[PDB]
Amino acid sequence: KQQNFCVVELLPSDPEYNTVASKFNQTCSHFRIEKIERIQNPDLWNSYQAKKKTMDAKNGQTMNEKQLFHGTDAGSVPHVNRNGFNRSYAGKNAVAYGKGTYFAVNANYSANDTYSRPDANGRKHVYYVRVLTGIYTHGNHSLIVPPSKNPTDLYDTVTDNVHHPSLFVAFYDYQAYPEYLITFRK
Ligand X SMILES: O=c1[nH]c2ccccc2c2ccccc12
Nearest distance from C-beta of residue 138 to ligand X, angstroms = 15
3-state helix, strand, coil in the chain (%, to 5): 25, 30, 40
**Regarding beta strands 136-138 and 157-159, do their DSSP bridges make them parallel or antiparallel, or are they unpaired?**
parallel
Q: Report helix, strand or coil for 10.
A: strand
- The residue range among 7-15, 42-50, 104-112, 143-151 that interacts with ligand X, by the rule CB under 6 A, is 104-112
Counting contacts by CB under 6 A, is residue 183 touching ligand X? no
**Regarding beta strands 136-138 and 176-185, do their DSSP bridges make them parallel or antiparallel, or are they unpaired?**
unpaired
Counting contacts by CB under 6 A, is residue 69 touching ligand X? yes
Nearest distance from C-beta of residue 181 to ligand X, angstroms = 13
Q: What angle do CA 68, 71, 74 make, to 5 degrees?
A: 140
Q: Give Dmax (Cα) for the chain.
A: 53
Answer yes or no: are the C-beta atoms of 132 and 175 closer than 8 Å.
yes
Counting contacts by CB under 6 A, is residue 134 touching ligand X? no
Q: Which of 104, 129, 131, 170 binds ligand X (CB under 6 A)?
A: 104
Q: CA 154, CA 62: separation in Å to the nearest integer?
A: 15
Q: Which of 64, 81, 110, 159 binds ligand X (CB under 6 A)?
A: 110
Nearest distance from C-beta of residue 137 to ligand X, angstroms = 17
- Window 161-180: contact mask with ligand X (x via CB under 6 A): ------x-------------
For residue 101, give the H/E element and its range. Answer: strand 101-104
Nearer to ligand X, 44 or 104 (CB): 104
- The residue range among 46-54, 67-75, 130-138, 147-155 that interacts with ligand X, by the rule CB under 6 A, is 67-75
Binding site for ligand X (CB under 6 A): 69-72, 92-94, 102, 104, 109-110, 115, 167
